[PDB]
Amino acid sequence: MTKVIVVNGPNQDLDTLRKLCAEWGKDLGLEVEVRQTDDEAEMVRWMHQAADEKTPVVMNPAAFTHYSYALADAAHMVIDENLPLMEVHISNPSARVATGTITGMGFYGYKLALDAVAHLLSE
Amino acid sequence: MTKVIVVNGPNLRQDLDTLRKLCAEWGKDLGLEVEVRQTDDEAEMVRWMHQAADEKTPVVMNPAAFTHYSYALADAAHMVIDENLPLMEVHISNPSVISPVATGTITGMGFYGYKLALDAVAHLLSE
């Protein structure tokens, strides 16, 4: 049972997402924890922790649209450990630092990100 | 089995054959009948998208080496999504006004990105 962390940036839904992610993870042999923070420094700490603990990461940067140099470095650190780092965006962008990206599938994008993590771990 | 078409641009035989087999099998497991096509001509991709709109077929598109799009392609894409048909966009690797207004986009997962796109389509068909 591989531990995987789903981390969300700024901008209720967390409980709903936790339930869905726990269930999706269980079906994939993953133990999934979901967290959320408005503090980029905390997100950076969580990334460093993931690298230490060897836990794949699913990240929805949300309101962190501008990766600080620190967050970009932390993301590179996770990738450099050969850990999957899946980036999820719930909505599509309008015309008006990751292993792979999933955009526009609502919360189902997290399910696909977990599938991707399980696939990369089985290689 | 719901028919789904996977359309690819130029410069993604062995690789396309592998992709085709994988899509066929992934589709089968999800109750989808999946056909995979490739073209170097954007006008042919437009014709395929028109056919998809006509036949009500979900589309998975990898524009591949097509870096810019014609208005005809953008229009064909709008017609597909306006019929509530998914137009999933897949990029093998990680990376506009004229755009295919994709329903959703998957990047960086190599061929596995297509499996994820198919899963997304099948999920919409679930009760």
mmCIF file of C-alpha atoms in Angstrom:
data_model
loop_
_atom_site.group_PDB
_atom_site.id
_atom_site.type_symbol
_atom_site.label_atom_id
_atom_site.label_comp_id
_atom_site.label_asym_id
_atom_site.label_seq_id
_atom_site.Cartn_x
_atom_site.Cartn_y
_atom_site.Cartn_z
ATOM 1 C CA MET A 1 0.000 0.000 0.000
ATOM 2 C CA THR A 2 1.988 2.992 -1.316
ATOM 3 C CA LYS A 3 1.329 6.327 0.398
ATOM 4 C CA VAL A 4 0.439 9.148 -2.030
ATOM 5 C CA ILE A 5 -0.243 12.748 -1.088
ATOM 6 C CA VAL A 6 -2.750 15.007 -2.868
ATOM 7 C CA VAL A 7 -1.921 18.645 -2.108
ATOM 8 C CA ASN A 8 -4.049 21.657 -2.936
ATOM 9 C CA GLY A 9 -3.166 25.340 -3.050
ATOM 10 C CA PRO A 10 -5.452 28.246 -2.183
ATOM 11 C CA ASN A 11 -8.981 28.694 -3.596
ATOM 12 C CA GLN A 12 -16.445 22.899 1.736
ATOM 13 C CA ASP A 13 -14.821 20.727 -0.971
ATOM 14 C CA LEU A 14 -11.861 19.213 0.922
ATOM 15 C CA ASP A 15 -13.951 16.585 2.795
ATOM 16 C CA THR A 16 -15.680 15.582 -0.444
ATOM 17 C CA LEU A 17 -12.364 15.275 -2.249
ATOM 18 C CA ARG A 18 -10.833 13.301 0.650
ATOM 19 C CA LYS A 19 -13.585 10.691 0.482
ATOM 20 C CA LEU A 20 -13.332 10.326 -3.276
ATOM 21 C CA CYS A 21 -9.514 10.133 -3.226
ATOM 22 C CA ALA A 22 -9.442 7.590 -0.420
ATOM 23 C CA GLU A 23 -11.826 5.334 -2.378
ATOM 24 C CA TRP A 24 -10.039 5.787 -5.703
ATOM 25 C CA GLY A 25 -6.699 5.111 -4.047
ATOM 26 C CA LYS A 26 -7.949 1.978 -2.317
ATOM 27 C CA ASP A 27 -8.986 0.566 -5.690
ATOM 28 C CA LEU A 28 -5.445 1.211 -6.979
ATOM 29 C CA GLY A 29 -3.584 -0.117 -3.909
ATOM 30 C CA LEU A 30 -2.691 3.424 -2.859
ATOM 31 C CA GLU A 31 -3.082 4.987 0.576
ATOM 32 C CA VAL A 32 -4.062 8.549 -0.234
ATOM 33 C CA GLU A 33 -3.949 11.563 2.036
ATOM 34 C CA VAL A 34 -5.416 14.873 0.926
ATOM 35 C CA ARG A 35 -4.224 18.228 2.231
ATOM 36 C CA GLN A 36 -4.810 21.890 1.458
ATOM 37 C CA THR A 37 -2.884 25.045 2.228
ATOM 38 C CA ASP A 38 -2.956 28.723 1.416
ATOM 39 C CA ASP A 39 0.704 29.088 2.499
ATOM 40 C CA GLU A 40 3.205 28.512 -0.311
ATOM 41 C CA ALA A 41 5.936 27.968 2.289
ATOM 42 C CA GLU A 42 3.914 25.092 3.752
ATOM 43 C CA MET A 43 3.371 23.641 0.271
ATOM 44 C CA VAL A 44 7.147 23.828 -0.202
ATOM 45 C CA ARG A 45 7.622 21.999 3.142
ATOM 46 C CA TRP A 46 5.179 19.286 2.032
ATOM 47 C CA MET A 47 7.131 18.795 -1.186
ATOM 48 C CA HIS A 48 10.403 18.433 0.706
ATOM 49 C CA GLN A 49 8.619 15.950 3.005
ATOM 50 C CA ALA A 50 7.332 13.949 0.038
ATOM 51 C CA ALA A 51 10.885 13.695 -1.286
ATOM 52 C CA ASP A 52 12.043 12.455 2.184
ATOM 53 C CA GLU A 53 9.192 9.997 2.611
ATOM 54 C CA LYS A 54 9.271 8.825 -1.036
ATOM 55 C CA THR A 55 5.576 9.595 -1.488
ATOM 56 C CA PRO A 56 4.287 10.377 -5.008
ATOM 57 C CA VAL A 57 2.554 13.725 -5.240
ATOM 58 C CA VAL A 58 -0.679 14.899 -6.924
ATOM 59 C CA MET A 59 -0.729 18.704 -6.851
ATOM 60 C CA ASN A 60 -3.464 21.135 -7.701
ATOM 61 C CA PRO A 61 -1.621 24.458 -7.497
ATOM 62 C CA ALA A 62 -4.975 26.284 -7.539
ATOM 63 C CA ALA A 63 -4.269 29.969 -6.728
ATOM 64 C CA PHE A 64 -0.491 29.396 -6.837
ATOM 65 C CA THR A 65 -0.505 30.344 -10.541
ATOM 66 C CA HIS A 66 3.008 31.807 -10.212
ATOM 67 C CA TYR A 67 5.354 29.182 -8.864
ATOM 68 C CA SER A 68 7.883 30.925 -6.640
ATOM 69 C CA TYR A 69 11.433 29.848 -7.346
ATOM 70 C CA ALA A 70 11.189 27.881 -4.061
ATOM 71 C CA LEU A 71 8.113 25.891 -5.152
ATOM 72 C CA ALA A 72 9.586 25.225 -8.610
ATOM 73 C CA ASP A 73 12.797 24.004 -6.933
ATOM 74 C CA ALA A 74 10.763 21.803 -4.557
ATOM 75 C CA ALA A 75 8.841 20.338 -7.481
ATOM 76 C CA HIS A 76 12.122 19.596 -9.313
ATOM 77 C CA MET A 77 13.401 17.940 -6.148
ATOM 78 C CA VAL A 78 10.447 15.528 -6.093
ATOM 79 C CA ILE A 79 10.856 14.746 -9.815
ATOM 80 C CA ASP A 80 14.608 14.208 -9.372
ATOM 81 C CA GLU A 81 13.896 11.446 -6.829
ATOM 82 C CA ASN A 82 12.039 9.690 -9.677
ATOM 83 C CA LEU A 83 8.737 10.218 -7.810
ATOM 84 C CA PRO A 84 5.668 10.956 -9.849
ATOM 85 C CA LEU A 85 4.442 14.531 -9.620
ATOM 86 C CA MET A 86 1.032 14.897 -11.265
ATOM 87 C CA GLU A 87 -0.433 18.338 -11.745
ATOM 88 C CA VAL A 88 -4.226 18.680 -11.731
ATOM 89 C CA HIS A 89 -6.386 21.614 -12.830
ATOM 90 C CA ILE A 90 -10.109 21.224 -12.180
ATOM 91 C CA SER A 91 -11.209 23.639 -14.902
ATOM 92 C CA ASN A 92 -9.977 24.530 -18.347
ATOM 93 C CA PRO A 93 -8.304 27.835 -18.984
ATOM 94 C CA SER A 94 -10.022 30.499 -21.091
ATOM 95 C CA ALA A 95 -8.567 32.428 -24.058
ATOM 96 C CA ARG A 96 -10.141 35.483 -22.393
ATOM 97 C CA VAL A 97 7.645 21.148 -12.693
ATOM 98 C CA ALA A 98 5.407 18.098 -13.245
ATOM 99 C CA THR A 99 5.617 14.573 -14.580
ATOM 100 C CA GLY A 100 2.298 15.076 -16.337
ATOM 101 C CA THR A 101 -0.714 17.378 -16.249
ATOM 102 C CA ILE A 102 -4.458 16.716 -16.230
ATOM 103 C CA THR A 103 -6.743 19.654 -16.977
ATOM 104 C CA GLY A 104 -10.468 20.199 -17.180
ATOM 105 C CA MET A 105 -11.963 17.001 -15.826
ATOM 106 C CA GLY A 106 -13.274 18.518 -12.627
ATOM 107 C CA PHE A 107 -12.506 16.466 -9.537
ATOM 108 C CA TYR A 108 -12.266 13.355 -11.795
ATOM 109 C CA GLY A 109 -8.875 14.727 -12.814
ATOM 110 C CA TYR A 110 -7.602 13.586 -9.399
ATOM 111 C CA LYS A 111 -8.809 10.048 -10.152
ATOM 112 C CA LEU A 112 -6.872 10.117 -13.423
ATOM 113 C CA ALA A 113 -3.827 11.535 -11.622
ATOM 114 C CA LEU A 114 -3.969 8.631 -9.094
ATOM 115 C CA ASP A 115 -4.271 6.148 -11.999
ATOM 116 C CA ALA A 116 -1.165 7.782 -13.515
ATOM 117 C CA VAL A 117 0.734 7.498 -10.211
ATOM 118 C CA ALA A 118 -0.150 3.782 -9.880
ATOM 119 C CA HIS A 119 0.951 3.214 -13.492
ATOM 120 C CA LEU A 120 4.273 4.928 -13.002
ATOM 121 C CA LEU A 121 4.904 2.940 -9.779
ATOM 122 C CA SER A 122 4.283 -0.398 -11.499
ATOM 123 C CA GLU A 123 7.005 0.237 -14.117
ATOM 124 C CA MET B 1 -19.559 -0.797 -27.214
ATOM 125 C CA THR B 2 -19.478 2.982 -27.888
ATOM 126 C CA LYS B 3 -17.376 4.048 -30.900
ATOM 127 C CA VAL B 4 -14.530 6.514 -30.162
ATOM 128 C CA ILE B 5 -12.014 7.873 -32.666
ATOM 129 C CA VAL B 6 -8.393 8.736 -31.819
ATOM 130 C CA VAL B 7 -6.898 11.152 -34.342
ATOM 131 C CA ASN B 8 -3.201 12.013 -34.512
ATOM 132 C CA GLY B 9 -1.202 14.607 -36.386
ATOM 133 C CA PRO B 10 2.211 13.984 -37.920
ATOM 134 C CA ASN B 11 5.406 12.795 -36.194
ATOM 135 C CA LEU B 12 4.222 11.355 -32.844
ATOM 136 C CA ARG B 13 5.009 2.688 -38.023
ATOM 137 C CA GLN B 14 5.956 0.642 -34.950
ATOM 138 C CA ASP B 15 4.894 3.404 -32.532
ATOM 139 C CA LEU B 16 1.543 3.986 -34.213
ATOM 140 C CA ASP B 17 0.925 0.223 -34.365
ATOM 141 C CA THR B 18 1.650 -0.055 -30.625
ATOM 142 C CA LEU B 19 -0.616 2.884 -29.870
ATOM 143 C CA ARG B 20 -3.384 1.419 -31.984
ATOM 144 C CA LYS B 21 -3.264 -1.950 -30.190
ATOM 145 C CA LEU B 22 -3.137 -0.326 -26.768
ATOM 146 C CA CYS B 23 -6.106 1.947 -27.549
ATOM 147 C CA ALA B 24 -8.084 -0.985 -28.890
ATOM 148 C CA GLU B 25 -7.496 -3.031 -25.692
ATOM 149 C CA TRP B 26 -7.952 -0.143 -23.275
ATOM 150 C CA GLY B 27 -11.164 0.752 -25.057
ATOM 151 C CA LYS B 28 -12.470 -2.819 -24.882
ATOM 152 C CA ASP B 29 -11.977 -2.896 -21.095
ATOM 153 C CA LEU B 30 -14.014 0.344 -20.869
ATOM 154 C CA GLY B 31 -16.792 -0.683 -23.289
ATOM 155 C CA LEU B 32 -15.441 1.464 -26.095
ATOM 156 C CA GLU B 33 -14.748 0.477 -29.715
ATOM 157 C CA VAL B 34 -11.643 2.560 -30.483
ATOM 158 C CA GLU B 35 -10.179 3.305 -33.899
ATOM 159 C CA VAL B 36 -6.819 5.071 -34.257
ATOM 160 C CA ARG B 37 -5.900 7.181 -37.273
ATOM 161 C CA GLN B 38 -2.977 9.412 -38.228
ATOM 162 C CA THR B 39 -2.575 12.130 -40.846
ATOM 163 C CA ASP B 40 -0.011 14.674 -41.971
ATOM 164 C CA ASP B 41 -2.810 16.817 -43.485
ATOM 165 C CA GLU B 42 -4.780 19.106 -41.203
ATOM 166 C CA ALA B 43 -7.641 19.250 -43.726
ATOM 167 C CA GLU B 44 -8.018 15.445 -43.340
ATOM 168 C CA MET B 45 -8.176 15.832 -39.559
ATOM 169 C CA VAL B 46 -10.916 18.439 -40.136
ATOM 170 C CA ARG B 47 -12.821 15.927 -42.288
ATOM 171 C CA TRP B 48 -12.525 13.338 -39.502
ATOM 172 C CA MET B 49 -13.853 15.803 -36.928
ATOM 173 C CA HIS B 50 -16.785 16.639 -39.194
ATOM 174 C CA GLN B 51 -17.496 12.909 -39.488
ATOM 175 C CA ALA B 52 -17.281 12.595 -35.696
ATOM 176 C CA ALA B 53 -19.813 15.410 -35.260
ATOM 177 C CA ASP B 54 -22.090 13.760 -37.880
ATOM 178 C CA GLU B 55 -21.835 10.263 -36.320
ATOM 179 C CA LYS B 56 -21.844 11.479 -32.677
ATOM 180 C CA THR B 57 -18.450 9.925 -31.954
ATOM 181 C CA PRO B 58 -16.287 11.084 -29.021
ATOM 182 C CA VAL B 59 -12.824 12.189 -30.156
ATOM 183 C CA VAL B 60 -9.359 11.893 -28.660
ATOM 184 C CA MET B 61 -6.917 14.191 -30.509
ATOM 185 C CA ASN B 62 -3.135 14.416 -30.404
ATOM 186 C CA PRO B 63 -2.211 17.309 -32.721
ATOM 187 C CA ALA B 64 1.418 16.110 -32.589
ATOM 188 C CA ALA B 65 3.567 18.103 -35.013
ATOM 189 C CA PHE B 66 0.656 20.389 -35.982
ATOM 190 C CA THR B 67 1.784 23.409 -33.975
ATOM 191 C CA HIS B 68 -0.814 25.872 -35.261
ATOM 192 C CA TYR B 69 -4.393 25.398 -36.187
ATOM 193 C CA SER B 70 -6.614 26.543 -39.016
ATOM 194 C CA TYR B 71 -9.953 28.225 -38.393
ATOM 195 C CA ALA B 72 -11.504 25.176 -40.100
ATOM 196 C CA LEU B 73 -9.968 22.900 -37.433
ATOM 197 C CA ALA B 74 -11.079 25.175 -34.597
ATOM 198 C CA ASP B 75 -14.589 25.306 -36.055
ATOM 199 C CA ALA B 76 -14.735 21.522 -36.441
ATOM 200 C CA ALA B 77 -13.678 21.166 -32.797
ATOM 201 C CA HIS B 78 -16.383 23.620 -31.641
ATOM 202 C CA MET B 79 -18.963 21.635 -33.566
ATOM 203 C CA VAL B 80 -17.926 18.422 -31.749
ATOM 204 C CA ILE B 81 -18.044 19.934 -28.249
ATOM 205 C CA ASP B 82 -21.253 21.871 -29.017
ATOM 206 C CA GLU B 83 -22.925 18.454 -29.626
ATOM 207 C CA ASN B 84 -21.841 17.483 -26.050
ATOM 208 C CA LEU B 85 -19.281 15.088 -27.494
ATOM 209 C CA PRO B 86 -15.933 14.962 -25.732
ATOM 210 C CA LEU B 87 -12.883 16.203 -27.602
ATOM 211 C CA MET B 88 -10.006 15.061 -25.417
ATOM 212 C CA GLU B 89 -6.580 16.458 -26.159
ATOM 213 C CA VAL B 90 -3.484 14.346 -25.474
ATOM 214 C CA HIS B 91 0.179 15.426 -25.672
ATOM 215 C CA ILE B 92 2.909 12.807 -25.376
ATOM 216 C CA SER B 93 5.213 15.238 -23.570
ATOM 217 C CA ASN B 94 4.581 18.367 -21.486
ATOM 218 C CA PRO B 95 4.556 21.803 -23.161
ATOM 219 C CA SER B 96 -4.594 30.023 -27.603
ATOM 220 C CA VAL B 97 -7.183 32.103 -29.518
ATOM 221 C CA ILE B 98 -7.452 29.654 -32.426
ATOM 222 C CA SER B 99 -7.715 26.358 -30.516
ATOM 223 C CA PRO B 100 -9.611 23.081 -30.460
ATOM 224 C CA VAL B 101 -11.394 24.085 -27.197
ATOM 225 C CA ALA B 102 -10.636 20.639 -25.799
ATOM 226 C CA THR B 103 -13.000 19.155 -23.297
ATOM 227 C CA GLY B 104 -9.968 18.225 -21.231
ATOM 228 C CA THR B 105 -6.233 17.851 -21.760
ATOM 229 C CA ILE B 106 -3.707 15.221 -20.666
ATOM 230 C CA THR B 107 0.018 15.836 -21.099
ATOM 231 C CA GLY B 108 3.325 14.121 -20.339
ATOM 232 C CA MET B 109 2.146 10.550 -19.931
ATOM 233 C CA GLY B 110 3.300 9.180 -23.275
ATOM 234 C CA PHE B 111 0.899 6.638 -24.717
ATOM 235 C CA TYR B 112 -0.702 6.198 -21.256
ATOM 236 C CA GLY B 113 -2.201 9.650 -21.684
ATOM 237 C CA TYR B 114 -4.525 8.121 -24.270
ATOM 238 C CA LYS B 115 -5.696 5.506 -21.720
ATOM 239 C CA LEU B 116 -6.513 8.340 -19.320
ATOM 240 C CA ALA B 117 -8.423 10.187 -22.064
ATOM 241 C CA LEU B 118 -10.437 7.033 -22.832
ATOM 242 C CA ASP B 119 -11.185 6.538 -19.128
ATOM 243 C CA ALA B 120 -12.470 10.128 -19.033
ATOM 244 C CA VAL B 121 -14.794 9.433 -21.957
ATOM 245 C CA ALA B 122 -16.101 6.145 -20.507
ATOM 246 C CA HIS B 123 -16.703 7.878 -17.187
ATOM 247 C CA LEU B 124 -19.151 10.274 -18.825
ATOM 248 C CA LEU B 125 -21.107 7.292 -20.188
ATOM 249 C CA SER B 126 -21.484 5.789 -16.704
ATOM 250 C CA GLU B 127 -24.868 5.947 -14.969
#
